Design an enzyme around this catalytic site. Structure first.
Site, PDB file in Angstrom:
ATOM      1  N   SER A  14      24.359 -29.465 -71.864  1.00  0.00           N
ATOM      2  CA  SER A  14      23.633 -30.351 -72.787  1.00  0.00           C
ATOM      3  C   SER A  14      23.483 -29.729 -74.176  1.00  0.00           C
ATOM      4  O   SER A  14      23.228 -30.508 -75.124  1.00  0.00           O
ATOM      5  CB  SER A  14      22.274 -30.765 -72.281  1.00  0.00           C
ATOM      6  N   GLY A  51      23.794 -31.295 -67.980  1.00  0.00           N
ATOM      7  CA  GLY A  51      23.525 -30.951 -66.558  1.00  0.00           C
ATOM      8  C   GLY A  51      24.547 -30.095 -65.865  1.00  0.00           C
ATOM      9  O   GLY A  51      24.333 -29.712 -64.704  1.00  0.00           O
ATOM     10  N   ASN A  82      21.687 -24.407 -66.654  1.00  0.00           N
ATOM     11  CA  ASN A  82      21.326 -25.328 -65.565  1.00  0.00           C
ATOM     12  C   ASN A  82      21.202 -24.559 -64.245  1.00  0.00           C
ATOM     13  O   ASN A  82      20.367 -24.971 -63.431  1.00  0.00           O
ATOM     14  CB  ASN A  82      22.291 -26.508 -65.477  1.00  0.00           C
ATOM     15  N   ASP A 163      10.816 -33.528 -74.678  1.00  0.00           N
ATOM     16  CA  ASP A 163      11.418 -34.438 -73.665  1.00  0.00           C
ATOM     17  C   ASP A 163      10.707 -34.135 -72.346  1.00  0.00           C
ATOM     18  O   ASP A 163       9.632 -34.709 -72.069  1.00  0.00           O
ATOM     19  CB  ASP A 163      12.959 -34.279 -73.660  1.00  0.00           C
ATOM     20  N   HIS A 166       6.878 -30.378 -67.955  1.00  0.00           N
ATOM     21  CA  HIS A 166       6.553 -29.955 -66.580  1.00  0.00           C
ATOM     22  C   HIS A 166       5.306 -29.062 -66.622  1.00  0.00           C
ATOM     23  O   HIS A 166       5.419 -27.906 -67.077  1.00  0.00           O
ATOM     24  CB  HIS A 166       7.642 -29.137 -65.927  1.00  0.00           C
TER      25      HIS A 166
END
Length: 189
Positions: A14, A51, A82, A163, A166
């Site tokens: 990405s 990804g 990733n 974005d 978490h």
């Protein structure tokens, strides 16, 4: 200037695909423009796939190279982030990257490796192991290395897209304290 452009393969995830960005704003696209200031007309092939793990990159490197009408004159390899996000084995990431570099070396394509760095969340043991794969691979495969590709944005949250959000374990506790009344009230007595 005279001549056809220099062909560069940008083989990554990405961070090369330009996730979240508009047309022309990805790293490969902006790098192509910037290289004019170095006396270079480049055509940078954007082989970034959002990804992609190291294993995914290994699975596609031959296809991506065989798909090219013009053989790359430099390959920039930017993978492993990733794997870190999945908490996957650093050793296996190294092995997969080795297979990518071995294919480029067989074809006599020069390599520039973009170094990835682990955040502290998986712990020092994992972080040290992960971080060390990139210098290891650069030496073994005679590749040039950018030690820390994301260094220029490390200290710059204003230059990072919002974005994924978490929560940490402590952040979870904050969410629980804010929402438990609603949950208790929604559960029929």
């Amino acid at each position: 200037s005279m001549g056809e452009s220099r062909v560069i393969l940008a083989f990554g995830d990405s961070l090369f695909a330009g996730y979240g960005l508009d047309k022309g704003e990805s790293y490969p696209a902006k790098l192509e423009t910037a290289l004019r200031s170095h006396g270079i007309n480049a055509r940078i092939i954007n082989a970034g796939v959002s990804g992609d793990t190291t294993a995914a990159g290994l699975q596609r490197i031959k296809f991506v190279l065989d798909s090219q009408p013009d053989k790359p004159e430099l390959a920039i390899v930017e993978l492993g982030g990733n794997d870190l996000l999945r908490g996957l084995s650093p050793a296996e990431a190294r092995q997969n990257l080795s297979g990518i570099l071995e294919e480029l070396q067989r074809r006599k394509i020069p390599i520039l490796l973009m170094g990835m760095r682990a955040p502290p969340n998986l712990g020092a043991k994992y972080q040290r192991e992960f971080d060390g794969i990139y210098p290891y691979l650069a030496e073994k495969y005679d590749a040039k290395l950018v030690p820390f590709f994301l260094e220029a944005v490390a200290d710059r949250p204003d230059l990072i897209q919002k974005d994924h959000v978490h929560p940490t374990a402590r952040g979870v506790e904050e969410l629980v304290s804010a929402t438990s009344n609603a949950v208790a009230k929604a559960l029929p007595a």
